[PDB]
């Protein structure tokens, strides 16, 4: 009856870059409120196949 | 395999996407597949031209 | 805007997903995967 799936999220400062191999550090988080409202429009899935 | 390191400022900025339209340059055209079931690699039987 | 700091938090956030829509969504995905 909760009707809400909740995910636990973290904000990180040191991340792997998507544009190439390497790491980068970003400055620490904003002290006020952060709000994001997004539409999940698709999924990226892979398969686990194999002989067994 | 050594490392190249850049140190620079991190100002915070507002960051939110704007839909971007790609457009053909003069001499070119873009064909669009209008099938609602197009699977990504087959033939498309309903094709329109856009810039 | 109600966070603290931890040391020896601020880096803590959550996301809410409609349960009903998510489960319905998977059921439809599954139907297509089942056909395949």
């Amino acid at each position: 009856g909760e009707q809400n799936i909740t995910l636990q999220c973290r904000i990180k400062q040191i991340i792997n870059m998507w544009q190439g191999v390497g790491k980068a550090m970003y400055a620490p988080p904003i002290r006020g409120q952060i709000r994001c409202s997004s539409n999940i429009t698709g999924l990226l899935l892979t398969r686990d196949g194999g002989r067994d | 395999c050594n490392t190249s390191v850049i140190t620079q400022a991190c100002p915070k900025v507002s960051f939110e996407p704007i839909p971007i339209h790609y457009c053909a340059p003069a001499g070119f055209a873009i064909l669009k597949c209008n099938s609602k079931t197009f699977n990504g690699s087959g033939p498309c039987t309903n094709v329109s031209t856009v810039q | 805007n109600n966070n603290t700091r931890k040391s020896i938090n601020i880096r803590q956030a959550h996301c809410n997903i409609s349960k009903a829509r998510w489960n319905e969504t998977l059921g439809q995905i599954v139907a297509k995967l089942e056909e395949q």
Partner: antibody
Amino acid sequence: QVQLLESGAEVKKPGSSVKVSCKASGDTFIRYSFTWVRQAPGQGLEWMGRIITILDVAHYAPHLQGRVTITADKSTSTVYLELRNLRSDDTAVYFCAGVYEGEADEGEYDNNGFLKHWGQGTLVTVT
Amino acid sequence: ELELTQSPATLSVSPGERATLSCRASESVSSDLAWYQQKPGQAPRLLIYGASTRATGVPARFSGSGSGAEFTLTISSLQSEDFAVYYCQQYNNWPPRYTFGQGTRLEIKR
């Protein structure tokens, strides 16, 4: 939660380099950032530089950029300082200091310069 | 690098009195200063984290605040234990080029 243990004292002829080190113990090495301070007699806490242990990078005060290297050995939890082209102006008690970076191992590094953990001081002089 | 100027050293404050210490930056600091206590032969222990947070193990007696380039430190009910030189440090520097001032020593009038 880290204790910093300084190495022994040194006396060097001008033009030589000195290697000074600190052993960090009691917690994960990688979660602490480290700095070096030069307590020259009659002076304040001159900052020499800082090393980041996840991204193995370091930054130095401008007047020492061609003179000081700060490095670390992740397997022995040891912070190292090498200062070259020594002058009598460099007579000082040198030491390590550092801070705890929350879950730095997982990418949550805070990047604090507010030093909490300090060594006892290594005296380096010239002759 | 950014210079930090303090009040004159050797502030004679009798034990039990409230001491006032201060620090002026050549440039603005976004509540990014720190205060440290140095005694001869001792580590320069952190007392205040940022402009106003007490560092671990720091008594209520030792506190302060500030903004911009003007910061103030006070010591309530000054103890014989507090007669040390207090250093001002600035961190709003990237790439790091952190600086310290000279600090002010407290003294007992004789």
